[PDB]
Amino acid sequence: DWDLVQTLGEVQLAVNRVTEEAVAVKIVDMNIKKEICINKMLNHENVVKFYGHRREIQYLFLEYCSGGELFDRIEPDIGMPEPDAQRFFHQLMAGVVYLHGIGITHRDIKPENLLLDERDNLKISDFGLATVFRYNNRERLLNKMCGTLPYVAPELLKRREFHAEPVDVWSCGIVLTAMLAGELPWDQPSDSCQEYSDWKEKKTYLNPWKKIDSAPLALLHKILVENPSARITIPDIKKDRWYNKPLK
Ligand SMILES: CSc1nc(O)c(Cc2cccs2)[nH]1
């Protein structure tokens, strides 16, 4: 039987006193039905593995990432070495392409939900807020507010309904911004927000943009586009110069 070593954040670390294997246990006491459902579909090296669950309080058995959250690899006001950021961003796109390929949107992509394993491989974690946006090759627009404000796409704040995919692309851009600058550009993406207004006006001589080399910044120019139809898609991110620029 598993022993709960410590609280990971509730999630606690469980270790098999026999095998000695480690996993992560998520404890929920009265959405959870869907988190499990969705988890059951998932299988990818950039998504936190679902092992199983048991209904005593409901217990979730998730891959343990001994690297912690990406959030804790970002030096405040500084970010991280551009090469580590690019690497994490590649794996983030792989994770996302995958989810999107099987009709699933995470809806809450942020450094707190990107975990690292022992080789610093990046895993998308927590599908508590995820949902299906394609079923039977039929796309459903999303009508519910979700996620965190700094990472949310603007159309979710001003539109009755919106496509799922560009919302995740936007959030990945903010994440890239965070990796490369150690700060978030704005509290939320509304015109009421001075900082978001400045970006729409291309004032890149301000923070965080001035801290970001011009190759990555040009990509951010394509991702952080307000019109979700104008916004770059992932196939096209895969062809961007910085994305493909080799880094030491
Ligand atoms: C996919 S659930 C989950 N797994 C882990 O590992 C966490 C959090 C943390 C792991 C290691 C430091 S925090 N949450």
Entry keywords:
3-stranded antiparallel sheet; transferase; globular; binds 2-(methylsulfanyl)-5-(thiophen-2-ylmethyl)-1H-imidazol-4-ol; alpha+beta; Transferase(Phosphotransferase), domain 1; serine/threonine-protein kinase; about 20% strand; Phosphorylase Kinase, domain 1; 5-stranded antiparallel sheet; about 250 residues
Structural account:
It is classed as transferase. Keywords: serine/threonine-protein kinase, phosphoprotein, checkpoint kinase, serine/threonine kinase, DNA damage, DNA repair, ATP-binding, CHK1, kinase, nucleus, cytoplasm. It forms a monomeric assembly. This protein is of the alpha+beta class. It folds into 2 domains: 1-75, Phosphorylase Kinase, domain 1, CATH 3.30.200.20; 76-248, Orthogonal Bundle (Transferase(Phosphotransferase), domain 1), CATH 1.10.510. It contains 8 helices and 12 strands. It has helices at 32-41, 82-101, 155-158, 164-181, 194-200, 214-223, 234-237, 241-244, and strands at residues 2-7, 11-16, 22-28, 50-55, 58-62, 68-69, 104-105, 114-116, 122-124, 131-132, 134-135, 138-139. The strands form 4 sheets. Strands 1-2-3-5-4 form a 5-stranded antiparallel beta sheet, with helices on one face.
Secondary-structure map:
Elements (H helix, E strand, L loop, with lengths): L1 E6 L3 E6 L5 E7 L3 H10 L8 E6 L2 E5 L5 E2 L12 H20 L2 E2 L8 E3 L5 E3 L6 E2 L1 E2 L2 E2 L15 H4 L5 H18 L12 H7 L13 H10 L10 H4 L3 H4 L4
Antiparallel strand pairs: 1-2, 2-3, 3-5, 4-5, 6-8, 7-10, 8-9, 11-12
Helix pairs in contact: 2-4
The protein binds 2-(methylsulfanyl)-5-(thiophen-2-ylmethyl)-1H-imidazol-4-ol.
The site of 2-(methylsulfanyl)-5-(thiophen-2-ylmethyl)-1H-imidazol-4-ol has 14 residues, from β6.
PDB class: transferase
Keywords: phosphoprotein, ATP-binding
Assembly: monomeric
